[PDB]
Amino acid sequence: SVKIVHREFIASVLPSNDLTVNNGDVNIGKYRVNPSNNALFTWLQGQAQLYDMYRFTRLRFTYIPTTGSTSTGRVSILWDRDSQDPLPIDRAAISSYAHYADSAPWAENVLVVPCDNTWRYMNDTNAVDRKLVDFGQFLFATYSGAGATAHGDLYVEYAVEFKDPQPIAGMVCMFDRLVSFSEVGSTIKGVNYIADRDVITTGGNIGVNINIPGTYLVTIVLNATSIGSLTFTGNSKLVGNSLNVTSSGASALTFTLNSTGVPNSSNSSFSVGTVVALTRVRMTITRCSPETAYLA
Amino acid sequence: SVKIVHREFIASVLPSNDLTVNNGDVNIGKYRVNPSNNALFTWLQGQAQLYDMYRFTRLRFTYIPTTGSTSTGRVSILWDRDSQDPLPIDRAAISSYAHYADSAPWAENVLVVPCDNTWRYMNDTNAVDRKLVDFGQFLFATYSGAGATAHGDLYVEYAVEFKDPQPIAGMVCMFDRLVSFSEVGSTIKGVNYIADRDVITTGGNIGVNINIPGTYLVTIVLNATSIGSLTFTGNSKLVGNSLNVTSSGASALTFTLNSTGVPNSSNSSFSVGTVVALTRVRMTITRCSPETAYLA
Amino acid sequence: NISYTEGAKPGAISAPVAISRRVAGMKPRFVRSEGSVKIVHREFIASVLPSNDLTVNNGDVNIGKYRVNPSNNALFTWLQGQAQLYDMYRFTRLRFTYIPTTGSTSTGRVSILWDRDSQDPLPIDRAAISSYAHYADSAPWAENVLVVPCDNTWRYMNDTNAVDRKLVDFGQFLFATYSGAGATAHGDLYVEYAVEFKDPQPIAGMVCMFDRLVSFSEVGSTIKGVNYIADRDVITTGGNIGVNINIPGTYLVTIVLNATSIGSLTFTGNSKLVGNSLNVTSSGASALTFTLNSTGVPNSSNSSFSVGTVVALTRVRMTITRCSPETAYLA
Amino acid sequence: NISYTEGAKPGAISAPVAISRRVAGMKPRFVRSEGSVKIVHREFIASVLPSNDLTVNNGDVNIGKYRVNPSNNALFTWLQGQAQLYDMYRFTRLRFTYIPTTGSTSTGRVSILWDRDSQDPLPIDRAAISSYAHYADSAPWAENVLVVPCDNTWRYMNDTNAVDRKLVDFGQFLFATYSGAGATAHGDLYVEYAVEFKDPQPIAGMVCMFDRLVSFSEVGSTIKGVNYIADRDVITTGGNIGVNINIPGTYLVTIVLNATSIGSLTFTGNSKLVGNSLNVTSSGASALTFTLNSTGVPNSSNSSFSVGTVVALTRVRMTITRCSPETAYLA
Amino acid sequence: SVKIVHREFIASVLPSNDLTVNNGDVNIGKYRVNPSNNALFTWLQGQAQLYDMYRFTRLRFTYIPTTGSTSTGRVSILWDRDSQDPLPIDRAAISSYAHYADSAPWAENVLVVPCDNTWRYMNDTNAVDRKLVDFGQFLFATYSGAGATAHGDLYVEYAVEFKDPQPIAGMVCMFDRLVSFSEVGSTIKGVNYIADRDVITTGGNIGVNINIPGTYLVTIVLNATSIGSLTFTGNSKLVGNSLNVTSSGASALTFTLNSTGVPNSSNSSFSVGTVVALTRVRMTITRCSPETAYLA
Amino acid sequence: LVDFGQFLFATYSGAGATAHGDLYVEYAVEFKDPQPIAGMVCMFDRLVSFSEVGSTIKGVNYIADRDVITTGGNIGVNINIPGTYLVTIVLNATSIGSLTFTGNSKLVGNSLNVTSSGASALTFTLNSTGVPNSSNSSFSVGTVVALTRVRMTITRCSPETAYLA
Ligand SMILES: [Ca+2]
Ligand SMILES: [Ca+2]
Ligand SMILES: [Ca+2]
Ligand SMILES: [Ca+2]
Ligand SMILES: [Ca+2]
Ligand SMILES: [Ca+2]
Ligand SMILES: [Ca+2]
């Protein structure tokens, strides 16, 4: 048994007047506590890919403000033992989790989750009853805030044991959408950096949203008559140079970007514009360091 | 502090009549014992990337035959505590080393290295005096043999301590050659899947050799008027679909392959043929699993 | 008898032309248990076929083919029968044994592996097969053994087709091989076990039922009962239907096709028809029943049985049952 | 593990396909001595190459190639370094060990011999090789050993090129072979020794200096320092110069030729150039420096390095030093 | 952690000559032992809704006659640890089970189930492999009997642990059928008071069967040109006043009823007659007390 | 990180031609791991066309960069460690003048010189007292034209191995 201790950043809490959970993302179990869930474990996943089974020994969630002391609102950090339970919508519900922590947006907060003795399977083999392979799910909620200045950040801190060395699961994610067939839906394999809704292919534009902090290598291949410009207008900056190959019928772009992880609903992490007759999107995303950025 | 134990495959030993060290690879650190060195630690690097320092507690190299009893010659396994020392050139020199073992190609063999108490740094890629950051270097040799079929496989088994969680070093390798300047030399960053001599760029051909066993994701962007065919006639097989975009002046290919790791001097891991006026090669290689292969 | 080897000084190693070990039948032992019964027994699995490129499980692409569950007859030819009768099981001792059946002249690697997660994908590269915690590697002409340390979790025999198999299986056995040559196998694989059964129950059933709405998609299906086949084993495309029973033994098949017309029933791969095949074709629907013997070794291009020249295939419903050849249809 | 051999009654002999023995590194032991130090150690010598006709020392014609003297790196790759430091030596234990590296299918004779006179000519016939007092014969696929009983005479390391070597060497090791076939070696030769060193001294020097007045004769020379080459190893005839370094390892060479003109420097035999070769040609004199790696196995027709198309060769002066490849010249 | 002990009524056993399991209900999980399952835990569900996980410590099923000594046949009580296993079809199969008991209809009987140490999840309604979230299933059977008057009543007595307070799952059931699409099938959410087959929607009638004993509050909204009468000719009686609003195109009825729980194949718990062009049925059922009945 | 510090000695307010006294080192030293002989050769390489200063030095450290002077039509090599050394020096330069031994070293036996247009080579073995000299190198090459490159090889050795006349 291999014993790992670490702390890592998850996501920033955006202000909201009405009660919103997980910055408005409606996916149940988005932050399921399974080390292969890169949306929660931005760092652990790198080590998780090498082992079959995991057991948390200590687990705590912290909230640290980045806003001023006159910001209004509630930040609630929560853990639900069942990673398949629906997201709460009401103010009674979010306060009723056994494992809760509440604070003003300008106050630090901590949530300790008492761990159990059960080993669980790490590997994502698209388990259907996820609750049986996750140690619950983390979630956050917020209300009574105003503006777009993020309140603060969320971190996870833990002790985990890992059990069986195995062939590496990898840090690659690949996305495939047949736009011919529909502008929504896709096949996604490997690491869950993006879900379906994170890739927008409509009205002559492609937006991809990497809403998990980090530096990533992307290579995207478009089946399209022609494409316009690659732009970085949202949560990510291009790191080093972007390699672009355009032809009639297909094009390919590769580059390393640096994402904040903070979701932007009007501007994607990167977009490609003026795309004519888009048939297919095939793409590969991989968490990495900035050292492997392409050169000028 | 974080204690890892594992056994992993290194390389298959090709037969040779004349003495051949490290399957003919000439480079001095090839198998420096440092967890970053993916040529030696085919599996461990995936964990090494997350930590600052290491210390080996137990370390042994194993040889298991894959050849027949009628195969002639010997396979030598060898450890030098100075990772910068030159490779030995004649068989007698091998016997001068304190830590070596030598056997028939048809016999299992083992070499136990006595470990010390000193911590050393995970990244050695900046470092100049690499002996101070490596726990020596492993070498293998063979002589008095014949045939194309490999004698047997080498493995490393160890118990190692890692010390400090860090930002991930990443599992990607970035290669860059300005072929217009010269058909040799390059900037390589990230993990050492390849070295300069592994990318052949001449006579209207491009061949790249991934002589480290595993499954990889690659993206090559080519600055060239036109290119011909992508072929896999060496130690690697295409996994899933290859995505190829060709234009006048530039081409991009992206695909995941499965390498046997064993070097082939006639056929590269992948080749691209009939290449006209190659000015620049920029490429990205990342160890992964086959689950993220591109679809047809 | 031991012989002296010519030209060896004391303590030398030698390679003989071939190594072997006699295997003898041993009736199962029945032992004291927390549950109903503990069985200590030993069963033959398969023979490792040679291949140059790395292949796992003699080329069977089905994940978890040798999942460790008493109801899986791919791993337990006899224990399957015993599994029928109980609800839950626990392995107490588990080991896999390799006996070479080839001379010391044969090249290659034979790897015997166990993956704690029975739903994990099959490995394809040399780094992967070497990286399993529970591994055992040898030349194909050498003996080998892999001991899997058991836990004390009870699991259900999956007789209700659990979707997350990993939670009902005790991992999966798998074997891999590379750099081999020739037509004949390298050696034989055995499983040796001690297994407890918990709760007596009505017989689970020996039948497998497969149902695909081809009109919806040429891929995907509902499979209930014993898992003799997986989805990918039934090919329905391009005017052909191919069914791959890649587990050895004798099977009764009834296949009912919703399709305008069908051509010939062929047995052109790993199976042979036993006795007579009963075929009824009409406009819009066809039915075939027959019993076959399958070697269970997977074939890329020729299914266990195929139905050719099939027109507007809308639906496949089929029933597959392990049985005796005695029960074959008459001429 | 010991196995039973099929079809043998008790006390039979068997031939396996191949015999081997693991060799492991063992650091030298240092022991009490009448002199400064006694070293107990073990070194690899060479691999016996197969030949149909009787050949000694893998075809090296140099008498006393494996003369027993610590300063002879043809026999002691490591002890040479140690010899540098002392005046005199005495071998206490000496044995030569043969490990086969070929199958029991291989034909031939391997003879390991020791001749008390290190200047005696090499034998060429089967009667001769069999007639040495200190001999050991085997099939090439069998293990063998030759124990040389030592005396207690101290000798000088010959670091001043003694002309009557026999009086400074403890005889010569040599090996012979015949009726073999194929490209690959029969087996490996090791020396195992206990040796005393007497008198500490300034390092003897690692350099060999060769000088031939070709204008006097195409044969003969002055050689001072380490004996990496003998006279016959430097060929100067017919517009060619060939230098044969028939002892393995890495060597720095500087060769200065008194000759009107020279052609190409070629590496066409047992050696490879390391890094860059530095060549300076003028009318009447040429100079080349480079460092090479030599396999040390003698070649009849292709020297370690050659200089072609050389005109009116008057003089060869050359310097050869065993060294590290690290020290090669840059491009 | 929270330790509950209770005894509660499950169902009355109707006589039958042929073998009849679970009073003729065909569904495989009917009495899965999971505190959410209100068909088995008529009382406990009201608490189960507030917690994430359960573990039974003691568990026994009791049968107390309500019939006469001259009633023929037998009543079988039965526990399968696999809650997904099919119902037995013949009497001999019942005897194959390890945990069953069988007696005269006029005799008290008990079946003690030995509990295990494993915690399982309270919600099983998402879960696919329900055996992993249920502690088996209870079944009852009867045969060799006759008459309309029930043989006796079944009860469950247990000591159970609950683990984590959560947002309430609620005590309401929501039923929805698009009858214009089909007269069968439906979306049912919340507590399992009813299953699809319990709402009959055909021949100008609507019947709904609440075959779980208790008092309920219902609201049915009907999409239909016109409706006739609300009747209570089955296992339920109106409590207080029924509130009926009829219009052209839509109707709403709301009332609280008192169900005996015993199924009736001729008369539903409540029926609405002479229903013209029913397109849609949407309904809400909530266990409650009679104190909240509507007034005249 | 590979040395156990450095010995050094200093002196002042002395007079006369003769030495003050002698320095000895007395030690007990352990050696760990047997290996193939490291090599006795030093290889020096300077791209003079790049800069008159800096170099690549591999092998035994008999000289440091500053010990090889390449400036103003002169090359000076200072072997400031005592003993006997084999030297081969190959100069990329249009022409060169005389080889002089005018400082701390003496030529042993004969010096072998080969000059051509664009390249020169010298081999010889010297004895050096190793005492540093400010103005006169161990050996010098004079009147050198368009010096582009110095590649040289220096090896501690025996005087027995000197070249013959
Ligand atoms: Ca919850
Ligand atoms: Ca695994
Ligand atoms: Ca069952
Ligand atoms: Ca059952
Ligand atoms: Ca001497
Ligand atoms: Ca002396
Ligand atoms: Ca060394």
Enumerate the domain spans of chain C. 26-203, 204-331
Question: Are D21 and C11 in contact (CB < 8 Å)?
Answer: yes
Q: Please choose, from the candidates B110, B105, B139, B108, the residue with its C-alpha nearest in 3D space to the C-alpha of residue B15.
A: B105
CB C41 within 8 A of CB C29: yes
Instruction: Assign domain E169-296 to a CATH class.
Output: mainly beta
CB E137 within 8 A of CB A98: no
F30 contact partners, CB below 8 Å, separation of at least 6: none
Report how far residue C126's alpha carbon sits from residue B11's, in angstroms, rounded to the nearest whole number.
9
**E132 alpha carbon – ligand 3 mean position (Å):** 12
SS (H, E, C) chain C: CCCEECCCCCCCEEECCCCCCCCCCCCCEEECCCCCEEEEEEEEEEECCCCCCCEEHHHCCCCCCEECCCCCCCCCCCHHHHHCCECEEEEEEEEEEEEECCCCCCCCEEEEEEECCCCCCCCCCHHHHHCCCEEEEECCCCCEEEEECCCCCCEECCCCCCCCHHHCCCCEEEEEEECCCCCCCCEEEEEEEEEEECCECCCCCCEEEEEECCCCCCCCCEEEECCCCCHHHEEEECCEEEECCCCCEEEEEEEEEECCECCCEECCCCEEEEEEEEEEEECCEEEEEEEEEECCCCCCCCCCEEECCCECCCEEEEEEEECCHHHCECC
Which chains share 3+ C-beta pairs under 8 angstroms with C?
A, B, D, E
Backbone torsions φ then ψ of C246, nearest 5 degrees: -100, 50
CB D141 within 8 A of CB D48: no
CB F119 within 8 A of CB F92: yes
Q: How many CB pairs under 8 A join B and C?
A: 88
Q: From the list A173, A174, A287, which residue is nearest B294 (CB)? A: A174
**E265 alpha carbon – ligand 4 mean position (Å):** 29
Report how far residue A176's alpha carbon sits from residue A169's, in angstroms, rounded to the nearest whole number.
19
**Category of C238 on φ-ψ map: left (φ > 0), alpha (ψ -120 to 50) or beta:** left
**A273 alpha carbon – ligand 3 mean position (Å):** 56
* A253: β partners: A220, A244
Q: Please choose, from the candidates A189, C122, C134, C136, the residue with its C-alpha nearest in 3D space to the C-alpha of residue B258.
A: C122
Q: Which ligand has its closest atom nearest to the C-alpha of B289? A: 2
**D192 alpha carbon – ligand 5 mean position (Å):** 24
CA distances (Å), A275 to each of A182, A205, A266, in order?
16, 6, 18
CB B260 within 8 A of CB B214: no
Question: Are C6 and D15 in contact (CB < 8 Å)?
Answer: yes
Backbone torsions φ then ψ of E267, nearest 5 degrees: -125, 130
- According to DSSP, residue A226 is labeled B
Backbone torsions φ then ψ of C26, nearest 5 degrees: -140, 120
Interface test mutation site (partner E, options C198, C199, C222, max chain E beta carbons within 10 A): C199
List the structure tokens of D331.
């491009």
CA distances (Å), F11 to each of A29, B282, E205, F15, F23, in order?
79, 60, 121, 11, 13
Report how far residue E180's alpha carbon sits from residue E199's, in angstroms, rounded to the nearest whole number.
15
Residues, chain B:
296
Consecutive H or E run containing D285? strand D285-294
List the structure tokens of F50.
């790049």
Burial tier of B245 (Cβ tally within 10 Å: 0-12, 13-18, 19+)? buried
Greatest distance between any 2 Cα atoms in chain D = 81
- Interface check C169 vs E, CB under 8 A: no
Interface test mutation site (partner B, options C119, C130, C132, C144, max chain B beta carbons within 10 A): C130
List the structure tokens of B261.
């790791």
**A5 alpha carbon – ligand 5 mean position (Å):** 64
- Interface check B295 vs A, CB under 8 A: yes
- Interface check A29 vs E, CB under 8 A: no
Question: Are C107 and B68 in contact (CB < 8 Å)?
Answer: yes
For residue A67, how far is the Cα from the chain centroid? Answer: 22
Instruction: Assign domain E1-168 to a CATH class.
Output: mainly beta
Q: What number of other Cβ atoms are within 10 A of residue C231's Cβ?
A: 13
Report how far residue F75's alpha carbon sits from residue F102's, in angstroms, rounded to the nearest whole number.
13
Query: Near ion ligand 4, which residues have CB within 5 Å?
Result: C 87, 201; E 80, 82, 85
Dihedral angle of Cα B7, B9, B15, B20, to the nearest 10 degrees: -80
Dihedral angle of Cα D211, D216, D217, D219, to the nearest 10 degrees: -20
Instruction: Measure A178 CA to nearest chain E CA, in Å.
Output: 29
Residues, chain A:
296
Report how far residue A176's alpha carbon sits from residue A180's, in angstroms, rounded to the nearest whole number.
12
| Interstrand relation of C4-5 and D13-14 (parallel, antiparallel or unpaired) | parallel
Report how far residue E262's alpha carbon sits from residue E198's, in angstroms, rounded to the nearest whole number.
12
Q: Please choose, from the candidates E252, E292, E267, the residue with its C-alpha nearest in 3D space to the C-alpha of residue E171.
A: E292
Which chains share 3+ C-beta pairs under 8 angstroms with A?
B, C, E
The chain A residue lying nearest E119, using CA atoms, is A118
Report how far residue C191's alpha carbon sits from residue C45's, in angstroms, rounded to the nearest whole number.
7
The chain C residue lying nearest B239, using CA atoms, is C124
Report how far residue B54's alpha carbon sits from residue B121's, in angstroms, rounded to the nearest whole number.
6
* F57: β partners: F44
Q: What number of other Cβ atoms are within 10 A of residue A155's Cβ?
A: 16
- Interface check F36 vs B, CB under 8 A: yes
Report how far residue C189's alpha carbon sits from residue C66's, in angstroms, rounded to the nearest whole number.
12
Report how far residue E242's alpha carbon sits from residue E260's, in angstroms, rounded to the nearest whole number.
19
CB D58 within 8 A of CB C44: no
- Interface check C5 vs D, CB under 8 A: yes
Report how far residue D145's alpha carbon sits from residue D137's, in angstroms, rounded to the nearest whole number.
9
User: What is the C-alpha R_g of chain B?
Assistant: 20
List the structure tokens of C242.
């191919």
- According to DSSP, residue D309 is labeled S
SS (H, E, C) D143-170: CEEEEECCCCCCEECCCCCCCCHHHCCC
Interface test mutation site (partner A, options C167, C219, C231, max chain A beta carbons within 10 A): C167
Which chains share 3+ C-beta pairs under 8 angstroms with F?
B, D
Question: Are C128 and B214 in contact (CB < 8 Å)?
Answer: yes
Question: Are D44 and B91 in contact (CB < 8 Å)?
Answer: yes
List the structure tokens of C44.
């033959």
Q: What number of other Cβ atoms are within 10 A of residue D9's Cβ?
A: 7
Question: Are B129 and F35 in contact (CB < 8 Å)?
Answer: no
List the structure tokens of D157.
């390391």
**E167 alpha carbon – ligand 1 mean position (Å):** 6
Instruction: Measure A272 CA to nearest chain B CA, in Å.
Output: 17
CB D278 within 8 A of CB D290: yes
Side-chain-side CA neighbours of residue D166 (13 Å): 9
Question: Are C126 and B260 in contact (CB < 8 Å)?
Answer: yes
Instruction: Measure F51 CA to nearest chain B CA, in Å.
Output: 23
List the structure tokens of F80.
């400031």
DSSP characters over D111-130: EEEEES-TTSPPP-SHHHHH
Q: From the list A190, A250, A292, which residue is nearest B170 (CB)? A: A292
- According to DSSP, residue A249 is labeled T
CB B141 within 8 A of CB B81: no
Report how far residue C254's alpha carbon sits from residue C286's, in angstroms, rounded to the nearest whole number.
11
- Interface check B91 vs F, CB under 8 A: no
CB C241 within 8 A of CB C307: yes
Helices of type H across chain E: 45-48, 91-94
C282 contact partners, CB below 8 Å, separation of at least 6: none
CB A147 within 8 A of CB A15: yes
Q: Please choose, from the candidates C253, C241, C103, C251, the residue with its C-alpha nearest in 3D space to the C-alpha of residue C184.
A: C103
E203 contact partners, CB below 8 Å, separation of at least 6: none
CB A26 within 8 A of CB A87: yes
| Interstrand relation of E280-288 and E172-177 (parallel, antiparallel or unpaired) | antiparallel
Q: From the list C87, C159, C163, which residue is nearest E81 (CB)? A: C87
* D20: β partners: C13
Of chain E residues 122-141, which have a CB less than 8 A from chain C?
A: 128-129, 131-132
Burial tier of E232 (Cβ tally within 10 Å: 0-12, 13-18, 19+)? middle
Consecutive H or E run containing D82? helix D79-83
Backbone torsions φ then ψ of E122, nearest 5 degrees: -65, -55
Report how far residue B91's alpha carbon sits from residue D188's, in angstroms, rounded to the nearest whole number.
10
Backbone torsions φ then ψ of B91, nearest 5 degrees: -60, -35
The single-letter code of the amino acid at A246 is T
CB D22 within 8 A of CB B101: yes
Domain F38-165 has CATH 3.20.20.70: no
Q: Please choose, from the candidates E206, E188, E271, E194, the residue with its C-alpha nearest in 3D space to the C-alpha of residue E236.
A: E271
Q: From the list C7, C17, C105, which residue is nearest D19 (CB)? A: C7
Instruction: Measure A217 CA to nearest chain C CA, in Å.
Output: 24
List the structure tokens of E208.
């709904």
- According to DSSP, residue B122 is labeled S
The single-letter code of the amino acid at B30 is K
Report how far residue B289's alpha carbon sits from residue E143's, in angstroms, rounded to the nearest whole number.
58
Note whether E touches B: 3 CB pairs or more under 8 A. Answer: no
The chain D residue lying nearest C11, using CA atoms, is D21
Query: E-assigned strands of B45-88?
Result: 53-65, 74-80
In this chain, the answer to whether the domains covering B1-168 and B169-296 adopt an identical fold is: no
For residue E22, the SS3 value is: helix
- Interface check A247 vs B, CB under 8 A: yes
Side-chain-side CA neighbours of residue D165 (13 Å): 23
CB C297 within 8 A of CB C331: no
CA distances (Å), D87 to each of B31, D70, D192, D198, D204, in order?
40, 10, 21, 6, 9
C253 contact partners, CB below 8 Å, separation of at least 6: C243, C288, C289, C290, C291, C292, C305, C318, C319, C320
Report how far residue F121's alpha carbon sits from residue C7's, in angstroms, rounded to the nearest whole number.
57
Report how far residue C329's alpha carbon sits from residue C102's, in angstroms, rounded to the nearest whole number.
39
List the structure tokens of A276.
């004519």
Dihedral angle of Cα D102, D108, D111, D112, to the nearest 10 degrees: -10
**C45 alpha carbon – ligand 4 mean position (Å):** 28
For residue D57, the SS3 value is: helix
Residues of C in contact with E81 (CB under 8 A): 87-88, 198-199
**Category of E193 on φ-ψ map: left (φ > 0), alpha (ψ -120 to 50) or beta:** alpha
Question: Are D295 and B18 in contact (CB < 8 Å)?
Answer: yes
Which residue carries 């209870």 as its tokens? E138
Report how far residue E176's alpha carbon sits from residue E285's, in angstroms, rounded to the nearest whole number.
12
What fold, for C26-203? Jelly Rolls (2.60.120)
Question: Are D20 and C11 in contact (CB < 8 Å)?
Answer: no
Q: From the list D28, D207, D322, which residue is nearest F158 (CB)? A: D207
Instruction: Measure F146 CA to nearest chain D CA, in Å.
Output: 17
Report how far residue A152's alpha carbon sits from residue A109's, in angstroms, rounded to the nearest whole number.
11
Interface test mutation site (partner C, options E19, E85, E113, max chain C beta carbons within 10 A): E85
Report how far residue E110's alpha carbon sits from residue E132's, in angstroms, rounded to the nearest whole number.
26
Report how far residue F101's alpha carbon sits from residue D186's, in angstroms, rounded to the nearest whole number.
55
CB B289 within 8 A of CB B242: no
List the structure tokens of D84.
């540098």
What is the arrangement of strands in the sheet containing D271-282, beginning at the earlier edge strand? Answer: D222-225, D207-212, D315-322, D249-258, D285-294, D271-282
**D160 alpha carbon – ligand 6 mean position (Å):** 10
Question: Are C116 and A163 in contact (CB < 8 Å)?
Answer: yes
What fold, for C204-331? Immunoglobulin-like (2.60.40)
